[PDB]
């Protein structure tokens, strides 16, 4: 029911505004240990030789590497994605140029997606970046994925209870609640805000008086938009393991400048990145993944904030493998 003292507290705003983080050491310790499982970088290899675009038969993304450099990435990918199944999770053992297994054709699109994040979304991932492990955590199914409807538990490696199963209709409210930090907000902020770019997260006016033509009757947005924004902000806050004073001065949520922290702007690029990953890379994968991977509406698993963060403001507390695998980005 209660968590013992002492607590870790930081300051994110001017003194006397009560802005900053409030952390529990025992929680942070468990996440630091869990995130320390990141396999260290593989050792450097010979830089001279032909490019695998010559050596091999069906290399389409990593063609400029040498053979030694290319088999290195093939080992790190296995360590990050399918370490227990080994090479044959994606490869016909008797012909490594065959695309006969569905994880092969998905892995190539993931190789392109990973380079895309590190090259086109540095406004967010910066120089830390992401590798296969950032999401997969050593399993082919990433632990924290979303479907077009709320699902429990949040960690798909955990066995669900009966009421937690998406088929049991009497537990819908709890499936909605736990994805919005236990609130009673009646909105699914993933499909609404993170699956695509259709809706507007901002709901507060930037004028002191009601502007004529958007302030009466059906000119108005419904107040349901304010709840939904609040729902996305409870899900954002929980998936990063933080509170809003990490980003807003609650004096004026809608105001930037001195009223917002530099992390709020990074968060803004994080929303534009999730939509790009969901719309252009992850959702079209339902034509390549087997029916046992799809959701009840034929959707492939998709990503939110928690896919990479898993309860920390920075994925893996900032651990990086960018300099060790340049073939993952940024791409010249």
């Amino acid at each position: 029911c209660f968590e013992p003292p002492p607590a870790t507290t930081t300051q994110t705003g001017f003194r006397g505004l009560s802005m900053g983080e409030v952390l529990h050491p025992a929680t942070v310790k468990a996440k630091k240990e869990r995130d320390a499982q990141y396999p260290p970088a593989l050792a450097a290899v010979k830089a001279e030789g032909p490019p695998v675009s010559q050596v091999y038969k069906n290399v389409k993304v990593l063609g400029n590497l040498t053979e030694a450099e290319f088999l290195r990435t093939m080992t790190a990918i296995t360590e990050w994605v399918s370490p227990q199944e080994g090479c044959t999770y994606c490869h016909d053992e008797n012909n490594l140029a065959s695309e006969a297994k569905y994880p092969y054709v998905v892995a190539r699109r993931m190789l392109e997606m990973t380079r895309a994040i590190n090259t086109n979304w540095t406004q967010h991932v910066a120089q830390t970046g992401v590798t296969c492990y950032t999401c997969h955590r050593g399993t082919p199914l990433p632990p924290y994925v979303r479907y077009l409807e709320p699902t429990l538990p949040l960690n798909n490696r955990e066995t669900p209870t009966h009421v937690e199963r998406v088929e049991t209709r009497s537990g819908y409210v709890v499936r909605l609640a736990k994805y919005t930090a236990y609130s009673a907000l009646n909105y699914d902020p993933f499909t609404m805000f993170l699956a695509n770019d259709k809706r507007q997260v901002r709901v507060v006016p930037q004028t002191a008086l009601p502007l004529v033509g958007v302030s009466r009757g059906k000119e108005r947005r419904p107040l349901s938009d304010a709840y939904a924004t609040f729902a996305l902000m409870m899900s954002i806050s929980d998936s990063l393991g933080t509170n809003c004073t990490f980003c807003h001065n609650a004096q004026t949520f809608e105001s930037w400048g001195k009223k917002s922290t530099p992390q709020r702007a990074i968060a803004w690029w994080g929303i534009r990145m999730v939509r790009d990953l969901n719309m252009n890379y992850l959702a079209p994968l339902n034509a390549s993944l087997p029916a046992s991977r799809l959701g009840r509406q034929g959707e492939a698993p998709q990503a939110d904030c928690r896919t990479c963060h898993q309860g920390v403001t920075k994925p893996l507390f900032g651990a990086s493998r960018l300099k060790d695998y340049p073939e993952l980005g940024p791409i010249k």
Partner: protein
């Protein structure tokens, strides 16, 4: 265009802000603060026009009161300073000064809604009784502040309008009289009524009633005030500093 915008840089929510302050201070200073002045005014040593109540049992009253008689205070000033304290010239409990002071209430019996005497002993209110489980104080000794038995409880006086005991009546030991005491000045135990406001000998000068089975509004004031004056005057130490 904006809803609520007016001339200049003015808006409607701005105007109501001035109106709200004007109404609040108008009610506070011009009404509530004048209703506060219906008693104790005018000062001695802005007022509202009189208010008249029609009493439930005949007659009227108009506040504040102008009594046909006023009492002579047995008090001596301690210094000529305008805000200097006064000092008793005799026995403050019987002279009724300071915490022993009573007000000049009407010498009438407080009445029930149907006209009967409101505060009466149980010997008159034979339809009343003490609730089952509570101590019946009749027949228990009254122990005063000095630890001496001041007397013995003879009856309880009940408020027939509210069903609430308000006094105990006790025979004063060695004085051939009975005095009333407000139950607030009584610590009711199973075998004794403890009273720390006054000493045993000071029970002899409790103000006496004109009638044995009724009490007036001023007699109730006189009886209550005598024990309260003992909080400060029962012993010389109670008027001094605690530390």
């Amino acid at each position: 265009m904006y809803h609520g915008a007016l001339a200049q840089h003015l808006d409607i929510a701005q105007l109501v802000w001035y109106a709200q302050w004007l109404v609040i201070w108008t009610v506070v200073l011009l009404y509530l603060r004048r209703e506060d002045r219906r008693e104790g005014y005018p000062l001695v040593e802005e007022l509202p026009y009189p208010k008249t109540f029609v009493l439930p049992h005949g007659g009227t009253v108009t506040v504040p009161r102008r009594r046909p008689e006023t009492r002579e205070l047995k008090l001596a000033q301690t210094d000529g300073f305008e805000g200097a304290p006064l000092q008793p010239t005799g026995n403050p409990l019987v002279d009724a000064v300071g915490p022993a002071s009573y007000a000049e209430r009407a010498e009438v019996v407080d009445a029930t809604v149907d006209g009967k005497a409101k505060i009466v002993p149980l010997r008159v209110a034979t339809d009343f009784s003490i609730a089952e489980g509570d101590v019946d104080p009749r027949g228990l000794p009254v122990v005063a502040a000095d630890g001496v038995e001041a007397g013995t409880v003879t009856d309880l006086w009940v408020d027939r309008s509210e069903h609430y005991f308000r006094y105990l009546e006790l025979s004063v030991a060695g004085s051939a009289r009975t005095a009333l005491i407000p139950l607030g000045f009584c610590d009711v135990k199973k075998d004794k009524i403890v009273v720390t406001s006054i000493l045993s000998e000071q029970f002899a000068n409790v103000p006496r009633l004109q009638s044995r089975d009724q009490i007036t509004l001023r007699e109730e004031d006189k009886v209550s005030a005598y024990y309260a004056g003992g909080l400060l005057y029962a012993t010389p130490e109670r008027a001094e500093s605690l530390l």
